[PDB]
Scaffold this active site. Structure first.
Site, PDB file in Angstrom:
ATOM      1  N   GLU A  19      -9.329 -13.637  -2.356  1.00  0.00           N
ATOM      2  CA  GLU A  19      -8.549 -14.059  -1.199  1.00  0.00           C
ATOM      3  C   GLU A  19      -9.230 -15.258  -0.546  1.00  0.00           C
ATOM      4  O   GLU A  19     -10.440 -15.242  -0.315  1.00  0.00           O
ATOM      5  CB  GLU A  19      -8.381 -12.920  -0.185  1.00  0.00           C
ATOM      6  CG  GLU A  19      -7.680 -13.360   1.082  1.00  0.00           C
ATOM      7  CD  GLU A  19      -7.349 -12.241   2.041  1.00  0.00           C
ATOM      8  OE1 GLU A  19      -7.650 -12.407   3.240  1.00  0.00           O
ATOM      9  OE2 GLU A  19      -6.799 -11.217   1.616  1.00  0.00           O
TER      10      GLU A  19
ATOM     11  N   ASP B  60      -1.362 -12.882   1.634  1.00  0.00           N
ATOM     12  CA  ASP B  60      -1.897 -11.772   2.412  1.00  0.00           C
ATOM     13  C   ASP B  60      -2.321 -12.392   3.736  1.00  0.00           C
ATOM     14  O   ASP B  60      -3.452 -12.830   3.888  1.00  0.00           O
ATOM     15  CB  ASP B  60      -3.067 -11.092   1.719  1.00  0.00           C
ATOM     16  CG  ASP B  60      -3.521  -9.848   2.459  1.00  0.00           C
ATOM     17  OD1 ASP B  60      -2.954  -9.539   3.531  1.00  0.00           O
ATOM     18  OD2 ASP B  60      -4.478  -9.191   1.993  1.00  0.00           O
TER      19      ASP B  60
ATOM     20  N   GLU C 282     -10.641  -6.736  -5.194  1.00  0.00           N
ATOM     21  CA  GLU C 282     -10.607  -7.715  -4.113  1.00  0.00           C
ATOM     22  C   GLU C 282     -11.920  -7.715  -3.352  1.00  0.00           C
ATOM     23  O   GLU C 282     -12.149  -6.814  -2.525  1.00  0.00           O
ATOM     24  CB  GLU C 282      -9.455  -7.405  -3.158  1.00  0.00           C
ATOM     25  CG  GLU C 282      -9.221  -8.426  -2.089  1.00  0.00           C
ATOM     26  CD  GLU C 282      -8.003  -8.067  -1.295  1.00  0.00           C
ATOM     27  OE1 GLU C 282      -7.072  -7.494  -1.900  1.00  0.00           O
ATOM     28  OE2 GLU C 282      -7.935  -8.414  -0.095  1.00  0.00           O
TER      29      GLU C 282
ATOM     30  N   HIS D  54     -11.474 -14.575   2.481  1.00  0.00           N
ATOM     31  CA  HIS D  54     -12.650 -13.710   2.195  1.00  0.00           C
ATOM     32  C   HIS D  54     -13.823 -14.559   1.718  1.00  0.00           C
ATOM     33  O   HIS D  54     -14.866 -14.399   2.190  1.00  0.00           O
ATOM     34  CB  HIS D  54     -12.318 -12.645   1.131  1.00  0.00           C
ATOM     35  CG  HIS D  54     -11.340 -11.584   1.539  1.00  0.00           C
ATOM     36  ND1 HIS D  54     -10.894 -10.582   0.809  1.00  0.00           N
ATOM     37  CD2 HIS D  54     -10.731 -11.354   2.638  1.00  0.00           C
ATOM     38  CE1 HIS D  54     -10.153  -9.814   1.513  1.00  0.00           C
ATOM     39  NE2 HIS D  54      -9.956 -10.307   2.598  1.00  0.00           N
TER      40      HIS D  54
ATOM     41  N   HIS E 175       0.853  -1.192   0.000  1.00  0.00           N
ATOM     42  CA  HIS E 175       0.000   0.000   0.000  1.00  0.00           C
ATOM     43  C   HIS E 175       0.886   1.238   0.000  1.00  0.00           C
ATOM     44  O   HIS E 175       1.961   1.246   0.620  1.00  0.00           O
ATOM     45  CB  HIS E 175      -0.880   0.096   1.263  1.00  0.00           C
ATOM     46  CG  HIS E 175      -1.805  -1.060   1.461  1.00  0.00           C
ATOM     47  ND1 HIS E 175      -1.396  -2.235   2.055  1.00  0.00           N
ATOM     48  CD2 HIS E 175      -3.126  -1.206   1.217  1.00  0.00           C
ATOM     49  CE1 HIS E 175      -2.414  -3.077   2.106  1.00  0.00           C
ATOM     50  NE2 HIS E 175      -3.478  -2.474   1.613  1.00  0.00           N
TER      51      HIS E 175
ATOM     52  N   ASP F  19       2.165   2.005   3.392  1.00  0.00           N
ATOM     53  CA  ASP F  19       3.159   1.107   3.959  1.00  0.00           C
ATOM     54  C   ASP F  19       4.579   1.553   3.626  1.00  0.00           C
ATOM     55  O   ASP F  19       5.528   1.246   4.360  1.00  0.00           O
ATOM     56  CB  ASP F  19       3.039  -0.320   3.409  1.00  0.00           C
ATOM     57  CG  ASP F  19       1.717  -0.972   3.666  1.00  0.00           C
ATOM     58  OD1 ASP F  19       1.102  -0.717   4.718  1.00  0.00           O
ATOM     59  OD2 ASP F  19       1.309  -1.784   2.797  1.00  0.00           O
TER      60      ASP F  19
ATOM     61  N   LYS G 288     -14.744  -8.833  -0.496  1.00  0.00           N
ATOM     62  CA  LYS G 288     -14.740  -9.327   0.891  1.00  0.00           C
ATOM     63  C   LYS G 288     -16.169  -9.142   1.386  1.00  0.00           C
ATOM     64  O   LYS G 288     -16.786  -8.116   1.088  1.00  0.00           O
ATOM     65  CB  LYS G 288     -13.771  -8.570   1.793  1.00  0.00           C
ATOM     66  CG  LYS G 288     -13.601  -9.189   3.180  1.00  0.00           C
ATOM     67  CD  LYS G 288     -12.621  -8.380   4.013  1.00  0.00           C
ATOM     68  CE  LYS G 288     -12.324  -9.094   5.319  1.00  0.00           C
ATOM     69  NZ  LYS G 288     -11.436  -8.332   6.218  1.00  0.00           N
TER      70      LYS G 288
ATOM     71  N   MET H  42       2.713  -6.022  -7.743  1.00  0.00           N
ATOM     72  CA  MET H  42       1.394  -5.488  -7.438  1.00  0.00           C
ATOM     73  C   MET H  42       1.527  -4.380  -6.416  1.00  0.00           C
ATOM     74  O   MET H  42       2.405  -4.416  -5.555  1.00  0.00           O
ATOM     75  CB  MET H  42       0.470  -6.599  -6.927  1.00  0.00           C
ATOM     76  CG  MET H  42      -0.932  -6.226  -6.485  1.00  0.00           C
ATOM     77  SD  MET H  42      -1.086  -5.621  -4.816  1.00  0.00           S
ATOM     78  CE  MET H  42      -1.243  -7.108  -3.888  1.00  0.00           C
TER      79      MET H  42
ATOM     80  N   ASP I 249     -11.863 -12.259  10.211  1.00  0.00           N
ATOM     81  CA  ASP I 249     -10.814 -12.472   9.240  1.00  0.00           C
ATOM     82  C   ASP I 249      -9.523 -12.843   9.955  1.00  0.00           C
ATOM     83  O   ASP I 249      -8.902 -11.994  10.593  1.00  0.00           O
ATOM     84  CB  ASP I 249     -10.703 -11.166   8.462  1.00  0.00           C
ATOM     85  CG  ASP I 249      -9.654 -11.182   7.432  1.00  0.00           C
ATOM     86  OD1 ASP I 249      -9.027 -12.238   7.210  1.00  0.00           O
ATOM     87  OD2 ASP I 249      -9.449 -10.099   6.837  1.00  0.00           O
TER      88      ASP I 249
ATOM     89  N   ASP J 188      -4.791 -13.954  -3.654  1.00  0.00           N
ATOM     90  CA  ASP J 188      -4.301 -13.787  -2.287  1.00  0.00           C
ATOM     91  C   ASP J 188      -4.519 -15.083  -1.503  1.00  0.00           C
ATOM     92  O   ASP J 188      -5.647 -15.591  -1.408  1.00  0.00           O
ATOM     93  CB  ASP J 188      -4.986 -12.623  -1.569  1.00  0.00           C
ATOM     94  CG  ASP J 188      -4.412 -11.249  -1.912  1.00  0.00           C
ATOM     95  OD1 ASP J 188      -3.516 -11.093  -2.771  1.00  0.00           O
ATOM     96  OD2 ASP J 188      -4.913 -10.282  -1.305  1.00  0.00           O
TER      97      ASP J 188
ATOM     98  N   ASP K 134      -6.534 -14.372   8.700  1.00  0.00           N
ATOM     99  CA  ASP K 134      -5.265 -14.188   7.993  1.00  0.00           C
ATOM    100  C   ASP K 134      -4.193 -15.161   8.479  1.00  0.00           C
ATOM    101  O   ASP K 134      -3.026 -14.785   8.656  1.00  0.00           O
ATOM    102  CB  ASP K 134      -4.763 -12.742   8.135  1.00  0.00           C
ATOM    103  CG  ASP K 134      -5.522 -11.762   7.255  1.00  0.00           C
ATOM    104  OD1 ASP K 134      -6.094 -12.181   6.233  1.00  0.00           O
ATOM    105  OD2 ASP K 134      -5.562 -10.561   7.601  1.00  0.00           O
TER     106      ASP K 134
END
Lengths: 386, 386, 386, 386
Positions: free
Chosen positions: C216, C286, C180, C219, C53, C56, C182, C87, C254, C244, C256
C-alpha cells in the site's frame, strides 16, 4: 515558454551552483567555480541576482589586499551584467573554530569572534546593496543533553542579535536581518528549529522591527511540517523578509533538491500563497545540483528551479481565475472564514441564543465541506487536465 | 521506593485512565469509568489532582438537571478525597459539528458556538479551582491546501483567544490560558503545530500576559523535535504554564505511552530541566493505558508514569550533585556559556583586537569540548552505574 | 476526459467509500452505507469491482440465516451490475478479542479462532470469485519490548500461513494469498513492517508460490521509503499479486488520502512502473474520504482516485513516447544498465586489464550523469508543460 | 566496573575513531590517525579487534610497494597487540567514480571496476583473518525517479553478488558476505533499504547460504523501524552474520552516535535479544566521535560504546533472572506464544468446536494482557530501581 526574466527576482547563492559535490560520504565531483563565472551564467539564465557568504567571495584568511581584489573582480562582473546582490550572510559553520557554534559557542572568546566576523561582512553587504542579512545558526545546538544549557544559549543568541541591531542602527544602515531556522543537521538538534521558534524569539529582541525570518522549504519539511502553513504565519506576522526555495523528500537528511522536486503539491500551494499575498522579496534558491552532474547539469538544474516556479505560478493563477474554482471555494465557505466571528462584541455573543441555546448542532454537523471536489479542481489545474 | 505523594503535584486527565480503548481500527476494550471512581483510584495512587474536558464530566447534550447532578457527584468525590482540579479544557474535537474546527471552522456559526461552549466551561473550571484553562485545537487545520486560508484562520484564532481574555478579565477570574500545540492528527496538519508557533502567536494577542503554552512530550516528538529544548524556550519566555507528560517513539501516530517510555533519555533531560528551573506547576500525564490492558493494567500504567518521573528526578539530582559531573561541566565550559558575550558593549567589542585581529583561530579550534565524557557520566547516572 | 472504464480494473473496498468517519479523536460523521448501494454507485463511476472484509459484508455474530441473506443481497447487486469481487480479506483487528493479534496473539486459543474465522471467509471469497485473499496483520506486534517474542511470533505467523496454504491446496482452490505489510498503527510496531520483510518471510513458507505481497502506497511512505522502488523489488521477485493505492504525506498517522494526493511525483513514477511492467492486477483504492465530506464528497473522492491514475498514466506514456526523453535516457545510460556486467564470466573479468589495471578512474569520474535534465523532462511531462 | 575485555568481542572500524570530523557543512576538526595507533589504543581499551575498508588501510591509488608497506605496518600492529580483524569491506562510495553506484552504476565499465576492487580486497581480508566481508551499497540508488531502473539494478546487483560468491567458492575461502541495508543517505533512496529488503534479495541469489545481513542500529531507525524486531527476523532466518552498533535519534540524518545514545530502551531490548539468542559474532561499533571532540574524547566515546553494552547486558540479565519478571512473563502469556497453534493439524483444527462454534469471544476479549506491569519491571531493571 516559462522563460525567467530579472523582474521575477529569482536569486541564487554562490554556494549553490558552486557546490563542488562533497557530501556526507563523498569527495568533490566538480572543480571550483569562479564567482565571476557564476554571475555571468546566472545572468544568462534570467536570474535577478546572487547572494554570498563572506567565505564564498573572499577566501578565509585573506589579507586586506587580496580581499579588495576579490571584491573588485566580483563588483566588475555585477556592473557588467546589471546583476544585484539582495542578500548576504556569514559563514559561521565550516571552520573548525565554530564546531560548537558561533553566537552560542560555550567558549566566550569564540562568541566574540563570531560577532566581529559578522559585523565585518554586514559592512560588505551594505557596500554591495544587500537589503537582507541572513543568519543561519547551523552549529548552534547539541548532540547530547548536557552539552548546551538552552536557556543560557538563548540569552547569548539574544545578546548577539541585539548587538548586531545596535550596530546597524548606529551606522544608519537600511539593511534588516532574517533568521533561518532549521531543525537539525549538522547538529543533532539546532536552536530555533522552525519558523515558529524563530518568530517567537524575534519578539523578545530589543528592536524586533529589524528582524524577520528566512524560511527554507526543506528545513520545515525535515520536521514534517507544512511549509505553506508556516509561510502563512510569517506573512500574518509581517516577518517574511526573504525566502529560500528548494525541494526535500520529507524527513531525512537535507537534500537541497531543485525547487519543484520533493513535495510538488506543497510547492504549488507555496507559489499560490506567495503570489496571492503579493510577496515582493527575492525568490532565492538555496539548492545543490546533485554531485552526479557535470556543469551542463549544474546550469540545467538552476534553470529548472526557475522554470518550475513559473509553471506553478501559471497553474495557480489559472486555478484562482477559474469561475468553477471560485464556486467551489464558496461551497466550502472559504469566503466565510474571512468574516469576523464576533465583531458584535463579547456581550452580544454571550446574549445570542442562536450561538448556543438555539444552535442546531446536528443540522450544522450534517453540512458537507466539499473539500475533496475543491482539491480535485486544484489537482486538475496543477496537472493541466481541466 | 519512589512512592508518589500529593506534594509531587502529579495530575491525570479523566480521559486518560478513562480511555475505553477505541481506536480507528478497533472497538472499545474496556467499559466506561465513572469519574467518581477515577478520582478515588487516582487519589489512592498518590495523585495530587485530576483534569477534565467538559464532555468527560458532563455527557454532551445533558440537561441542566443532569449537568448539575454530574458536577455534584464529581465535587463530592473531590471533597471526599482532597483531590484538586488544577486545569480544565473544552472538547472541541469529538463531535461531528467540529469536523472542520472550532475557533477556525469555515462556518461562522460554528466558531461562535465553540466560543460559547468554551466560556461555559471556563466558569465551571474556575468554580472547581482550576488555575489553567487549556486549549488544544485538534481540529484546526486541513488535509488539503485549498481548504483553509491560514492567514484568515490565524485572524479568527486571535479573535477567539482575544474574546476569551476579555471574558476572564471582565469576570475578574485569576485563571490563565495555555495553548497546546500539536503538528498533526487528527487533521493532516494542525494550526500552531509546535511550541514555537504557539509562543509566536501569543505575542500578537491583545493581552499576551494571560496566555502561555501547554507542551506535550509526544506532540513535539511527532515533529522530530527535542522536547527539552522546546521547554527551555518556553521557560526562557516565561510561558510554561502547564505541561503534559507521556511517551512517544518519534515520528509516527500519537501513541500516548506512559511517561518514561518512548525516548527515555529525553525524559531524563526533561525532568532535569523542570527540577533545575524550579517549575512549580502540575506534572500532568496525558497518556492512554494501551487497549491490551484491563483495569489492573490501567492503574499500573498510571502508577508507572509517576514512578518513572520520580526515578528520573533522583538520577538527575544525583548527576548534578556529583563532583565529577561538576568538573565535567567546567571542562565543557558550561560556566562560560552563562557569561555575557560582550557586557563591555558594542564599541568595546569593536575596539577589542583580541576578538578579531589577534584572535588565534587555530588555537581555539584545537580545543576539545569534552562533551562525550560529560554525556557518559549522564548515562552512568541514568542507569545507576553511579 | 480521463473517464474510467471497467477494463481499467479499478476496485474499491466496501470499507473505503463506506467509512463512517470515526477517527483517532472523533465520532462518525456519516451514516452507514448499504453494500448494495456501494456496488451500484461504484459501477456508475466506472469501477471494475469491489472487495470486502468478512465483517463488512456480514455483521459480526450473524446467524447462518442472516449470513445467507446478506450475501444473497450482495450477490444480486453484483449480478445486476456485472461488478466483480477480485479480492477479499478477514477482519482480524476491530473486535477486542484481537487486541493482541490474530495469528500471533500470545493466547493460543485466539490464534486458533483467528484461523477458523479466516478459513470460513476464504470459502466465501472463492464463492464470490476472488483471485486474491489479502492478510493485513494490523494487530500483530507490540507497544513494548517485553510483550512479544518476535522469533516466536514469526514461527506462529509461518504456522498460520502454512495451514492456510494447506487448506487451499487440499480444497483445490485457485486463490492466492497477498500479505499487506505496514510499519506501525494501530500497534506501536507491526510485524512484517515493509514489502521487504514480507517478501523475505514468504520465502520461508512451505509453499511460497501461493503467497505474494499487497503493498500500500501510504504504508511504505509511513516508513519514509520509496514506494516505486519497493514495487520494483516485488515485480522483480514475481510477487506483486495485488496493490493498494492511496495518498500519504510522509511520516505520520495513516492518512488514507485519495490516490494522487500526498506524494504526487511518487504517484507518477508508480503509474509509470505499473504500466511499463505490464502489471495486470487490480488497481485497488484503499482510501478514506475525509470525514469533512458528505456523500457527494464520498463519490467525488472515489472518482478522483481513478481520475488521477488516468491523468498520470497519460503523462507517463507521453514521457516514455517522447524522442527527447528517450535521448535523455540514453545520455544518462539507462539503456546500459540493462547490459550484463560480466556475461563473459568471472575468469574473463579477472583477466580483463580494462576493468582494473588500465581503467581510467579520473576519466570515468568526469562523466556527467545528465540526471537533472532527464528529471526536468519528467516534470515538464507531469505538469503538461512541454 | 563494566570493564571490557577481548572475550566480549567488541570491534571498531578504523574509520570510526579515525573520522577526522568532515561533514557537508564542515571542515575536519581532527588530524588523521595512523591505523597503527588506532590498533594500539583500541587494544588498550579492551577491544577484540578492528575492521577496515580497503581505502582506510591503503591510500587510494597506492603503488604495490606502498600497498605492501601499509599492510605490513598494520599487520605488525596486529601481531604486537593480538588484535583480530573479523570483518572487512570495500569503499565503493567516496571516490567520484562511484557517484552513481558501484555494482549498479549505469555505466558498465564502473560496475566491472567495482567488482575488481572488491575482489582484490576479499583476498586481503582473508589473509588478515576476516570471517565476514561486508557490502554497504551507499551509492546504489537515486535522487530522481527516472535515473535508475530498479528492476535492471536488482539484476545487476544479483549478478555482482553471484560473481563474488563464485569467486570465494572457487578459491575455497571460508569467508561469508553480509549485506548492510540503509534507507537513504548519501543517495536520496538507497537500494535494499532495510533488513527485510536485503533478506528477500539474498533468497534469490544463486548460493544464498553464503550471504547474510549486517544490520546497523541507526539505519533501521532512519526508517522509523524497530531495530530489535528486525534483528529477530534476521536471527529467525539464520542470517545475522554481523551487526553494527551505534545510536540514532529516529528519522533524520545519519548521526552515528556512540552505542547507548539515541534510543536507549531499544538498545536494552537489542542487548537482551543478542544475549538471549546466543549471538556469537562481533559486537562492532560503526559510530563517529562527534567533531566537537579532541582525541581524548575520541577514546572516551569508544570506551563508552563498550561500557553501555556491558551495563545493558547486566540489566537485561537481571531482568530475565528476576522471579517477579518470570511471573509477569507468564501473566502476559509469553509461554503460550511459544506453543504451536495447531500441532494437531489442519483437519483437527477444522473439527475443533472449541476453536470456533463454541469459542467464547467475549470471555477471551475480557482478559487483560498485563503488558504494562511487565514493561515497568523492565524499566525498573534498566534504571537500576531493581
Amino acid at each position: 515558454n516559462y522563460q525567467p526574466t530579472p523582474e521575477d527576482r529569482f536569486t541564487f547563492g554562490l554556494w549553490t551552483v558552486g557546490w563542488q559535490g562533497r557530501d556526507p560520504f563523498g569527495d568533490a565531483t566538480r572543480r571550483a567555480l569562479d564567482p565571476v563565472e557564476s554571475v555571468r551564467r546566472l545572468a544568462e539564465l534570467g536570474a535577478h541576482g546572487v547572494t554570498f557568504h563572506d567565505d564564498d567571495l573572499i577566501p578565509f584568511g585573506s589579507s586586506d589586499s587580496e580581499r579588495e581584489e576579490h571584491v573588485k573582480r566580483f563588483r566588475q562582473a555585477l556592473d557588467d551584467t546589471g546583476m544585484k546582490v539582495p542578500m548576504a550572510t556569514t559563514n559561521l559553520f565550516t571552520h573548525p573554530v565554530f564546531k560548537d557554534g558561533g553566537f552560542t559557542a560555550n567558549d566566550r572568546d569564540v562568541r566574540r569572534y563570531a560577532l566581529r566576523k559578522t559585523i565585518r561582512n554586514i559592512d560588505l553587504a551594505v557596500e554591495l546593496g544587500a537589503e537582507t542579512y541572513v543568519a543561519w545558526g547551523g552549529r548552534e545546538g547539541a548532540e547530547s543533553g548536557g552539552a548546551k544549557d538552552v536557556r543560557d544559549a538563548l540569552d547569548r543568541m539574544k545578546e548577539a542579535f541585539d548587538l548586531l541591531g545596535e550596530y546597524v542602527t548606529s551606522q544608519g544602515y537600511d539593511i534588516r536581518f532574517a533568521i533561518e531556522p532549521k531543525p537539525n543537521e549538522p547538529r543533532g538538534d539546532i536552536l530555533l528549529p522552525t519558523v515558529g521558534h524563530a518568530l517567537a524569539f524575534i519578539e523578545r529582541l530589543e528592536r524586533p522591527e529589524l528582524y524577520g525570518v528566512n524560511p527554507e522549504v526543506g528545513h520545515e519539511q525535515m520536521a514534517g511540517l507544512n511549509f505553506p502553513h508556516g509561510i502563512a504565519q510569517a506573512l500574518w506576522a509581517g516577518k517574511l523578509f526573504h525566502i529560500d526555495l528548494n525541494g526535500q523528500n520529507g524527513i531525512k537528511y537535507d537534500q537541497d533538491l531543485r525547487f519543484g522536486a520533493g513535495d510538488l503539491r506543497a510547492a504549488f500551494w507555496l507559489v499560490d500563497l506567495l503570489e496571492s499575498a503579493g510577496y515582493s522579496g527575492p525568490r532565492h534558491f538555496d539548492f545543490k545540483p546533485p554531485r552526479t552532474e557535470d556543469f551542463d547539469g549544474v546550469w540545467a538544474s538552476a534553470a529548472g528551479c526557475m522554470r518550475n516556479y513559473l509553471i506553478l505560478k501559471e497553474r495557480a493563477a489559472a486555478f484562482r481565475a477559474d469561475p468553477e474554482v471560485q464556486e467551489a471555494l464558496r461551497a466550502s465557505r472559504l469566503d466565510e472564514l474571512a468574516r469576523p466571528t464576533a465583531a458584535d462584541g463579547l456581550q452580544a455573543l454571550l446574549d445570542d441564543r442562536s450561538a448556543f441555546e438555539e444552535f442546531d448542532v446536528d443540522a450544522a454537523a450534517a453540512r458537507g465541506m466539499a473539500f475533496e471536489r475543491l482539491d480535485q479542481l486544484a489537482m486538475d489545474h496543477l496537472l493541466g487536465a481541466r
